[PDB]
């Protein structure tokens, strides 16, 4: 690989591809990931293809680079190469890291902005524990094969952020408050990703769940009909609880 060319890949990796092909028309590939050298051959000249290596503990490693360089898959197998232990797929600014070990699985999704969904203790029915890691705070809850449900409790109010298997966010609020004068109810608008809270037949605040994986809160005037001021981004879990008081 004396006169190879270096190619940047998703997942903060680099591959070297030979400048010209062998007698079969194929290009040599070399990459180093952490301590491990990987090597392969490809029928393309751009850095795409498959590289393989073996760790010191005899685990087999495969790096698969998609044809257009938009995706990398980094896989680790047991020493015979049959049983997959871990798989990291990176593309479009996001990574998904899956590991299966000792009865349960894990899946960590890292979004382009650094926020994460962490699914742990995944069982054969698709259930598990769920955490969303946002900037400044974490939301915790559960996973089923149908949805992720992340829960914040304040007083008799329970706020539930649902993420469907498809990735669609919806939010609900349920309040066990006996008193009809203080009980919170809320309505969800999927068109604006906004939960509007009502108390005593007047709107009190809008909670917006943004495409940037943030939450903002904005109050209504005492008339219960017009918004006032400007929306404030939540920076810590305590401020979500404050919005539920």
Curated annotation (Swiss-Prot):
Function: Induces host (human and mouse) cytokine release by monocyte cell lines via TLR2 and CD14; nonlipidated protein does not stimulate host cells.
One Pfam family hit: Lipoprotein_1
SUPFAM superfamilies per record: Outer surface protein
Family note: Belongs to the OspA lipoprotein family.
Recorded topology in the membrane: Lipid-anchor
Record organism: Borreliella burgdorferi (strain ATCC 35210 / DSM 4680 / CIP 102532 / B31)
GO cellular component, one term: cell outer membrane
Locations listed in the record: Cell outer membrane; Cell surface
Superkingdom classification of source: Bacteria
InterPro entries in the cross-refs: OM_lipoprot_Borrelia, OM_lipoprot_dom_sf
Principal localisation: membrane
Name of this protein: Outer surface protein A
Consequence of changing residue 89 to A: In strain: PBre
Name of the gene this protein is made from: ospA
Keywords: Cell outer membrane, Lipoprotein, Membrane, Palmitate, Plasmid, Signal
